[PDB]
Design a protein around this ligand. Structure first.
Ligand SMILES: Nc1nc2c(ncn2[C@@H]2O[C@H](COP(=O)(O)O[C@H]3[C@@H](O)[C@H](n4ccc(=O)[nH]c4=O)O[C@@H]3CO)[C@H]3CC(O)(O)C[C@H]32)c(=O)[nH]1
Ligand SMILES: O=S([O-])[O-]
Ligand SMILES: [Cl-]
Length: 393
């Protein structure tokens, strides 16, 4: 068990840098621990201790408690909005002040960790949405993988009619809504104001709610989409690439990965970038900061990124990772890794506002759930979301 190995490594160590994370298990937790085990073996008496804090929401709550208690870890995973929050307290070390080189990091990811021109995060486990699909079920009914939103809706209705059940499965949540919202031309910031109830928002939430009414979209209310597989016909989901190993272990059918359907065939749709960056807390000792420096250099190395990305379905964050022989050997055997990289070229972020975590779950996610599960009118549900968000900001 890698967490037992690390516990023993850290027991023999003169300096331990704690890294608080939101991996509850599967391949992401095993890949993070395996990376830490190798880092720790290369050091002389210096270690990283990964500390599971629950999911990402539990992690952000535990960091809030840590600020209140006046005792932060050395490193933590952080979404771009969590970075914005922690910078209000000036709790974060600039990454380049540690002497970590970021050249060769993808500008999609590096730009998202740059605040006021300075980098306060190291992109580590960055995901993109992809189209997961049931190759067997599409083959059975001769339905090509849809390249456009129009094709996707047609494919879902045709397969749902043939199978007697809704085949597009989705979580009624902010992540899923972002795919439809972005690819209907939606934009969350209008002259720097956060807008949740634009016509593209209403259109995105109407399309999902109509999908449920018309019997081609199946809301998943309990667990992850990959935990629900096997109950009723499944053709498609739009989901994080970090879901890849979880789909593979659950799927009784031949799992497919495609680029996202876009407005036209001239370009794939935009996917939502999720997963986290590593931040380094100012409060850490110079000795713990020096361990963070080396760990970050290690996490950005082409081998570390190649192994982590091939073990998980996360997007390798560097140019050098794609040139690493381990990455190349996996990609040559499994086209899904190249599909994830291609889709990572067409990448949108949610707003990096300090309040965004509360807004995306408690306000926006609640409005999506009202409309999908309680048949609330999409505009009325999003107008309420807008009022609650305007009150919070
Ligand atoms: N706190 C906070 N969370 C945020 C923010 N923006 C987006 N997200 C959440 O990031 C999750 C995606 O990040 P990612 O690392 O791509 O995927 C996660 C897991 O989602 C995924 N997983 C785990 C178990 C499983 O059976 N299936 C599976 O796919 O594996 C990875 C590690 O757990 C989304 C999903 C959500 O958690 O419901 C809400 C979303 C934010 O601003 N703050
Ligand atoms: O972001 S570039 O790959 O179009
Ligand atoms: Cl959580």
């Amino acid at each position: 068990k890698p967490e037992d190995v690390i516990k023993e490594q850290c027991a023999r160590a003169k300096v331990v840098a704690e890294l608080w994370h939101g991996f509850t298990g599967g391949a992401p937790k095993a890949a993070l621990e395996n990376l830490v085990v190798e880092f720790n073996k290369a050091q002389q008496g210096r270690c990283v201790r990964p500390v599971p804090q629950g999911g990402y929401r539990d992690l952000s709550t535990k960091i809030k408690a840590a600020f209140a208690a006046g005792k932060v870890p050395t490193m933590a995973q952080a979404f771009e909005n969590n970075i914005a929050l922690y910078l209000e307290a000036k709790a974060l070390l600039p990454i380049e002040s540690l002497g970590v080189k970021l050249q060769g990091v993808n500008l999609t990811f590096l730009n998202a960790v740059r605040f006021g021109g300075v980098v306060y995060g190291v992109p580590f486990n960055k995901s993109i949405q992809v189209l997961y699909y049931n190759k067997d079920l599409l083959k059975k009914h001769g339905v090509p993988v849809p390249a456009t939103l129009e094709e996707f809706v047609a494919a879902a209705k045709k397969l749902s009619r043939a199978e007697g059940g809704p085949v597009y499965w989705f979580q009624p949540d902010a992540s899923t809504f972002a795919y439809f919202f972005f690819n209907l031309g939606g934009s969350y910031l209008k002259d720097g104001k956060l807008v949740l109830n634009s016509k593209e928002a209403v259109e995105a939430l109407t399309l999902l709610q109509n999908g449920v009414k018309e019997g081609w979209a199946k809301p998943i209310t309990s667990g992850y989409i990959n935990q629900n597989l096997g109950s009723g016909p499944y053709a498609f989901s739009v989901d994080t690439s970090a879901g890849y190993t979880y789909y593979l272990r659950a799927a009784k059918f031949d799992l497919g990965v495609a680029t996202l359907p876009g407005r036209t065939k001239g370009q794939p749709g935009y996917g939502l970038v999720q997963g986290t960056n590593l931040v380094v807390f100012r409060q850490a000792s110079k000795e713990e900061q020096a361990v963070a420096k080396d760990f970050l250099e290690f996490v950005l190395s082409p081998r570390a990124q190649a192994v982590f990305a091939t073990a998980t379905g996360y997007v390798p964050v560097t140019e050098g990772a794609l040139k690493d022989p381990v990455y190349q050997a996996y990609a040559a055997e499994n086209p899904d890794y190249a599909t994830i990289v291609r889709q990572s070229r067409y990448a949108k972020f949610e707003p990096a506002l300090a309040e965004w975590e509360q807004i995306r779950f408690d306000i926006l996610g609640q409005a999506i759930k009202e409309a999908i599960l309680n048949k609330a009118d999409p505009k009325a549900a999003l107008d309420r979301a807008q009022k609650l968000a305007e009150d919070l900001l």
